[PDB]
Amino acid sequence: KEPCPPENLQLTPRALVGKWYLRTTSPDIFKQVSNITAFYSAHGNDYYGTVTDYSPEYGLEAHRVNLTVSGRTLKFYMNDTHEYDSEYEILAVDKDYFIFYGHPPAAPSGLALIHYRQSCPKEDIIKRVKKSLKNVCLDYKYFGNDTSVHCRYLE
Numbered sequence: 001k002e003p004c005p006p007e008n009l010q011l012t013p014r015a016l017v018g019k020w021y022l023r024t025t026s027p028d029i030f031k032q033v034s035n036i037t038a039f040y041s042a043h044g045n046d047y048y049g050t051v052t053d054y055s056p057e058y059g060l061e062a063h064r065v066n067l068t069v070s071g072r073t074l075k076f077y078m079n080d081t082h083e084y085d086s087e088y089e090i091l092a093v094d095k096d097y098f099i100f101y102g103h104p105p106a107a108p109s110g111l112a113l114i115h116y117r118q119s120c121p122k123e124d125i126i127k128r129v130k131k132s133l134k135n136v137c138l139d140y141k142y143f144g145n146d147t148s149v150h151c152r153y154l155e
């Protein structure tokens, strides 16, 4: 129902800018959605962006999203479904990845989402991810990966 964050961590400006691949989550949401790709342009400490994401039934759908940042959390809102909307606590930041925990409609119990800079990361990265997850009461064990985009290091 809850992890154990860094004592602060906070964030940094323009840190979530650019393009990320959401390939690992706990719980695994990858039966429902797949090939999640997300581009972020930074309006100050906030950001707007688009989240492209293939469903089983329907095609490659995008979503308009805005992140209203405020310390070590942010309000994720998407103008479309309003289903993954929630305050999200940043749990780790890095060059190649960042991790967020939150309690959307979809996973009120709690949802952890790992974004990656590259669609298939090298094993170096995955290990730092491992580290970060442990540092905050979590493990790759309970994290499901998006197989729909093969990556050997996410197996």
Ligand SMILES: *[C@@H]1O[C@H](CO)[C@@H](O)[C@H](O)[C@H]1NC(C)=O
Residues within 6 Å of the ligand: 035, 037, 054, 060, 148
């Ligand atoms: C994932 O999206 C990218 C967007 O260009 C595309 O190249 C790739 O083939 C996609 N695969 C899907 C929709 O599963």
Ligand SMILES: *[C@@H]1O[C@H](CO)[C@@H](O)[C@H](O)[C@H]1NC(C)=O
Residues within 6 Å of the ligand: 046, 047, 066, 067, 068, 077
């Ligand atoms: C994000 O979108 C919501 C949608 O209602 C809005 O209330 C909020 O002020 C927006 N923040 C911006 C524009 O960064």
Ligand SMILES: *[C@@H]1O[C@H](CO)[C@@H](O)[C@H](O)[C@H]1NC(C)=O
Residues within 6 Å of the ligand: 126, 140, 141, 143, 144, 145, 153, 154, 155
């Ligand atoms: C996700 O990938 C990691 C390796 O990167 C692995 O340890 C983990 O068990 C995988 N989870 C599933 C269920 O795919």
Ligand SMILES: [Zn+2]
Residues within 6 Å of the ligand: 001, 002, 003, 102, 103, 110
């Ligand atoms: Zn919580």
Ligand SMILES: [Zn+2]
Residues within 6 Å of the ligand: 033, 053, 054, 055, 061, 063
């Ligand atoms: Zn979608």
Ligand SMILES: [Zn+2]
Residues within 6 Å of the ligand: 150, 151, 152, 155
């Ligand atoms: Zn493989």
